[PDB]
Amino acid sequence: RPRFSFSIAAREGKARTGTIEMKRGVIRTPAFMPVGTAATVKALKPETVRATGADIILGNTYHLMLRPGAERIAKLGGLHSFMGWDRPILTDSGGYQVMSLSSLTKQSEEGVTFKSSRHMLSPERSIEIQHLLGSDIVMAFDECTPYPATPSRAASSMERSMRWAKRSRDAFDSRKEQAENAALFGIQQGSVFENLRQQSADALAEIGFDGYAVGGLAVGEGQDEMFRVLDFSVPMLPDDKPHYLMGVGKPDDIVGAVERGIDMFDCVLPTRSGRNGQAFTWDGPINIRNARFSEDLKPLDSECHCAVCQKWSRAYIHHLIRAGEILGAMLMTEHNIAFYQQLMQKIRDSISEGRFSQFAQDFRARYFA
Amino acid sequence: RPRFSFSIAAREGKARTGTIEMKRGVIRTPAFMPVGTAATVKALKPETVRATGADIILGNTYHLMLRPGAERIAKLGGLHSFMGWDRPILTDSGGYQVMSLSSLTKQSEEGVTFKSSRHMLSPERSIEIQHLLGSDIVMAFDECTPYPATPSRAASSMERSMRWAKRSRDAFDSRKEQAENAALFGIQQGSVFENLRQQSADALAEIGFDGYAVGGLAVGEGQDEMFRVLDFSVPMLPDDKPHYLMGVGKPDDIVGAVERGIDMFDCVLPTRSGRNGQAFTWDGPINIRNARFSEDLKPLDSECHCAVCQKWSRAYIHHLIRAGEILGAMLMTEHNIAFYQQLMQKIRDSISEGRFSQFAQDFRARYFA
Ligand SMILES: COC(=O)c1ccc(CCNc2nc3cc4nc(N)[nH]c(=O)c4cc3[nH]2)cc1
Ligand SMILES: COC(=O)c1ccc(CCNc2nc3cc4nc(N)[nH]c(=O)c4cc3[nH]2)cc1
Ligand SMILES: [Zn+2]
Ligand SMILES: [Zn+2]
Numbered sequence A, B: 001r002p003r004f005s006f007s008i009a010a011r012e013g014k015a016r017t018g019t020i021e022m023k024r025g026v027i028r029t030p031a032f033m034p035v036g037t038a039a040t041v042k043a044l045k046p047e048t049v050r051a052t053g054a055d056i057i058l059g060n061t062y063h064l065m066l067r068p069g070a071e072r073i074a075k076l077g078g079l080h081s082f083m084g085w086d087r088p089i090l091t092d093s094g095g096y097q098v099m100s101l102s103s104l105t106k107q108s109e110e111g112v113t114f115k116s117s118r119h120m121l122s123p124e125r126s127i128e129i130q131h132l133l134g135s136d137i138v139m140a141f142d143e144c145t146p147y148p149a150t151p152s153r154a155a156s157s158m159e160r161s162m163r164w165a166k167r168s169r170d171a172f173d174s175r176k177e178q179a180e181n182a183a184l185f186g187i188q189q190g191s192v193f194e195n196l197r198q199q200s201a202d203a204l205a206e207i208g209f210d211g212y213a214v215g216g217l218a219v220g221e222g223q224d225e226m227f228r229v230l231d232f233s234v235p236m237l238p239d240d241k242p243h244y245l246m247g248v249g250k251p252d253d254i255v256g257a258v259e260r261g262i263d264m265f266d267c268v269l270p271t272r273s274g275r276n277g278q279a280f281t282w283d284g285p286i287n288i289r290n291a292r293f294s295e296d297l298k299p300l301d302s303e304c305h306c307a308v309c310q311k312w313s314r315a316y317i318h319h320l321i322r323a324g325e326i327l328g329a330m331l332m333t334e335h336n337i338a339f340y341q342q343l344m345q346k347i348r349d350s351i352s353e354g355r356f357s358q359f360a361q362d363f364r365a366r367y368f369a
Helices: A046-051 A061-066 A070-075 A079-083 A097-101 A123-133 A151-174 A176-181 A194-207 A223-236 A251-258 A269-275 A307-311 A314-322 A326-352 A356-367 B046-051 B061-066 B070-075 B079-083 B097-101 B123-133 B151-174 B176-181 B194-207 B223-236 B251-258 B269-275 B307-311 B314-322 B326-352 B356-367
Strands: A004-012 A015-022 A025-029 A031-033 A057-060 A089-092 A104-107 A112-115 A118-121 A137-139 A183-188 A211-214 A243-245 A264-266 B004-012 B015-022 B025-029 B031-033 B057-060 B089-092 B104-107 B112-115 B118-121 B137-139 B183-188 B211-214 B243-245 B264-266
Touching (some): A004 A326, A025 A031, A025 A326, A061 A070, A061 A089, A061 A097, A061 A118, A061 A123, A070 A123, A089 A123, A118 A123, A123 A137, A123 A176, A151 A176, A151 A183, A151 A194, A183 A194, A194 A223, A211 A223, A223 A251, A251 A326, A269 A326, A314 A326, A314 B079, B004 B326, B015 B326, B025 B031, B031 B326, B057 B061, B061 B070, B061 B089, B061 B097, B061 B123, B070 B123, B089 B123, B118 B123, B123 B176, B151 B176, B151 B183, B151 B194, B211 B223, B223 B251, B269 B326, B307 B326, B314 B326
Parallel strands (some): A031 A264, A057 A089, A089 A137, A137 A183, A211 A243, A243 A264, B057 B089, B089 B137, B137 B183, B183 B211, B243 B264
Antiparallel strands (some): A004 A015, A015 A025, A104 A112, A112 A118, B004 B015, B104 B112
């Protein structure tokens, strides 16, 4: 019923748990968003994505504007109807993918021109594409500063992102239907530099957003450095709005980020690694292709509540993946996404119950044994 | 409850409809068996295969004996438990696939030695592999005569198959658990030659089987010739047992074969063509990759009752297949197998109601319009 309402139900240290209520559904936080870049969470029907526990999925302005096209998706009824997912969708703004995937780019104050075949992205165009898609959470159009960067290059990059954040805010607010039905998140930049992170947080808070992402991380800096930056960066963001760490991550990354005040996550790891034969378990990842699993009748994980672990053995899935069978990718992906959702549920419950510190400790001791 | 009981409920001309009762379930006839060569019906969970209406699926002695291995599958609890399909499974005997897929073969009265890596198949070994798999319908080990063949080569080939049929019968009967719980089908050979087909039918009937397959067809002869051979060959088989046409086929092939007395079918077409972008419809096949479907909001088929057609558009599936997305293969395959099952249901109902001739006419007029 509400457009966007974030409520924090419980806290432990910097960790929080609660809910975001939106018109298309409730998002339990901390939340993990399966990635659906090509208007599909790879190898899963939307009903299966929901069955694993996902409340919201992620889509991408960059990919969808190229294929099948934003105007086309709008003509077909919007992204939700198109792919058959009726719950909230967050869309990245294109700011990162344009620089990561394009064959040629030209950057300027206006935006980014690129070859996929020539196209343009700008704060205004990004917001309009996300409107055409019918995104529930719209990301500001930003620049993900390369890593490493000199302080001066990080500063000029972050400042451009802040000017683009204001343009994103204005474009979103100009579109009445979008402003009434969707939410807009700003993206903090500043590389690894505390003063720049502060300047970025200040600029975003002055503009005002429904939520705040920590951008510019998970770009090769490694966990120690990422955690160091989160240590000072997250407290700079408004406490009363959600905090979204873009592109993170491995299970231990998620746990440590929640310890540092992050509420939302997305990553291709569970889907991509699932297809590649890696299954997540409470005792750490396993590669199901390994010969040691060829006659193993146990499920992928001994505690996992997912449909895959209720029905099929490691031995069968091993056979499927080694044979290159589509069902192998399906089962591995469903299990991995379910594992990620169970991780988030355990995080939420432990924070609610004031035992998250103990959970994090127990989780790590077992996962890395 | 019974091991194997075939009942014919209704007839129209040469067409029949009825049921095969087996310990693991009832098979409604005429029946279409989805193919699950690598211990999976490609891109479908077993529950989805069942949801489309399938009563029985097909597996393959040749593929499974190589990967993951027959003794291995038995150690893991049998094929049913391994893949999660608890209903009847028919297994081909290896007789056809060994000659179709092997890199090198040596044929003799004993059987066939082949390179996948050196292995052997014989009537006794084939029956034992099918026992280890836990097949419900076991096929005799035969030789699918190449096409075309001289009458003399067809004759010597068919005669060897008949000697192998008796050895198959004896091997099956020697295994008490198999003889008590499974059924054994013989395979008629004789190429396109009426006298040889008759000699083959006579030999098989003298031995006695639970069902009779028409082998040696769908080998490049084309529909006209296949129908010509079926015209005289099917009446040679015992009327009171099921008639199984191996490897057939396209929807019109199935309809014409039922008109000629066939009760059971298997084919990779719906699964394989589904993955390749071909969808079956009552107005004929379509290729969903075609640009004409890019903004088509209609389901794959306007009448189809399957879950895919209830939820997703041609436009979305077009996008998925062009993007190489696994969900594209999943949805196309589910629809195609569901279409095949709906075809079989319409065939069964029309025979039951004494209007199958009219159905065949109406079907063709529309399918080929
Ligand atoms: C050498 O590179 C690497 O090691 C490496 C490590 C992790 C990822 C996972 C993805 N991480 C990630 N996704 C991201 C997406 C983003 N989107 C926007 N709009 N702005 C950002 O600031 C941003 C940062 C990201 N970081 C990708 C690359
Ligand atoms: C040039 O070749 C072609 O045109 C062509 C046409 C259709 C198929 C589909 C498959 N047809 C088929 N599968 C078959 C499987 C069989 N198994 C046994 N044990 N004995 C047979 O006698 C037999 C015949 C078959 N015929 C395969 C090949
Ligand atoms: Zn699981
Ligand atoms: Zn359908």
